[PDB]
Amino acid sequence: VIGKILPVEDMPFLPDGTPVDIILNTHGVPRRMNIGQILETHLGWVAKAGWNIDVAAGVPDWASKLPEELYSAPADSTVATPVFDGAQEGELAGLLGSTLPNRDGEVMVDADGKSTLFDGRSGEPFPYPVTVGYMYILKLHHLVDDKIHARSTGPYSMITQQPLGGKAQFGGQRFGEMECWAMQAYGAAYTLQELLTIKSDDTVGRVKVYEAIVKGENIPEPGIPESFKVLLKELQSLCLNVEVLSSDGAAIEMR
């Protein structure tokens, strides 16, 4: 996910003044076990930064098994590397060792494939050279226009008396069992009992709490959840007489 969009200037930038577009976290790589992106990155620098390799009078070792006439390449040279018969390990060590004076008469990236970056934010140089390069990145469909969703109140379902699901109907967000488990593990009876009554079900509850909030009064104590009425009526529909007794005295209806 895009954690932060930095203003152009506060961005680790090359000695020629080009700000890098993205910074991917290093700790990810050895854990996730996908170094590919780094070789892809490296070769990228070789792809953008054109390379007239001063081959040699007797050819360099890395270019002993050099592919079809791939010794010179102009600026922004688009390269093909198949997924097994592709660019080898040590080849890239030869391919980065390649002169490309980007307007100014100096190389940016070193033999190893790292570059000395100036911090846009701080203003200092980074104390060690960091692995810059060109990477092909993909705009993914998992978008905030799909994912982001909010609801203070809104339009409720007719069948159930708890807020709907989905951004289209302006729904709520699902408070599951596992959340109740955690609420109870905290021991936050009031939060859970607020979530499972006025925030979802109780028709008097929601309007009364909205009214009480907009008036700026004490939140009314949630009394009669719709779920319990539903289950009481539903159990009484299957010919089971269920009556809630007090500690001492006579029994009551909920209303």
């Binding site: 996910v1 976290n25 700790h27 104390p127 599951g176 009031y190 939060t191 607020e194 006025i198 709490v209």
Partner: protein, 265 residues
């Protein structure tokens, strides 16, 4: 700001410039319950103070990801607004991240440096020999060279390309409570809030100890995640939760600040 409730309900619909100065006033120390499905443990839900940020993203804290088990690879978290004074209170008292540092499982701190902050603080505190501005202690010919009157002097020396942040150096410390043996030797009777003492550490370890509480003894050891866990556990066992909850925040700040100049690529 709104003449009538209907007009307010219009103005909030239009999202006019006059609401944004108010939303800070309304959100001022007003907690929200962050929850990720599937909720695998109690720390899978946590209450926070919502800061208002631009963009379309919930800005989670880097320390609560161990608890939530939430990688930033397209994972989404639900926010809830406690309404009742009781819910609002309980959100602030029970399930506030700062309170829930230790695991219900063991009581090991879960809200601790992880992945990045670990490498950051590890680089920060790791003492490596053969570095720039190293304390030599020259023998009869020259001065000792690498001794420092204050951490400030050393920060001034390190801001210049002269002294490296990782080297055996001899600082004179005052604000940091010394090691048990060192207090037991030098002071014995009184402590050391104002009392001065010489260490043989690295500026990074001093800068790290600067984060941990004024009265806490000195580390002088590289911050491996086990050692971090041990120290933060010890601090959690010995000190109040707010102190630990700030020290771990400073540990995060410094951790990330130094995770850059780590040179880990």
């Amino acid at each position: 700001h709104a003449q009538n409730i209907k007009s307010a309900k219009r103005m909030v619909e239009r999202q006019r410039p006059q609401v944004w100065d108010v939303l800070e006033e309304v959100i001022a120390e007003h907690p929200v319950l962050l929850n990720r499905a599937p909720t695998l443990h109690r720390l899978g839900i946590q209450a926070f103070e919502p800061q208002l940020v631009e963009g379309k993203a919930i800005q989670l804290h880097p320390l609560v990801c161990e608890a939530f088990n939430a990688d930033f690879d397209g994972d989404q978290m639900a926010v809830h607004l406690p309404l009742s004074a009781e819910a609002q209170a309980e959100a602030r008292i029970l399930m506030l991240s700062s309170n829930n540092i230790l695991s219900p499982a063991s009581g090991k701190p879960l809200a601790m440096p992880r992945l990045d902050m670990v490498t950051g603080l590890y680089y920060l505190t790791t003492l490596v020999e053969g570095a720039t501005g190293e304390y030599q202690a020259a023998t009869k010919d020259a001065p000792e060279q690498g001794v420092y009157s204050s951490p400030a002097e050393a920060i001034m020396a390190m801001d210049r390309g002269a002294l490296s942040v990782r080297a055996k150096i001899k600082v004179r410390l005052t604000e940091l409570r010394p090691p048990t043996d060192l207090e037991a030797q030098l002071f014995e009777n009184g402590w050391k809030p104002g009392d001065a003492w010489t260490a043989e550490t690295t500026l990074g370890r001093v800068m790290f100890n600067e984060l941990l509480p004024k009265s806490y003894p000195f580390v002088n050891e590289q911050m491996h995640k086990k050692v971090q866990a041990r120290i933060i556990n010890d601090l959690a066992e010995r000190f109040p939760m707010i102190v630990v909850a700030q020290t771990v925040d400073k540990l995060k700040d410094a951790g990330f600040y130094w995770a850059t100049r780590s040179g880990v690529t």
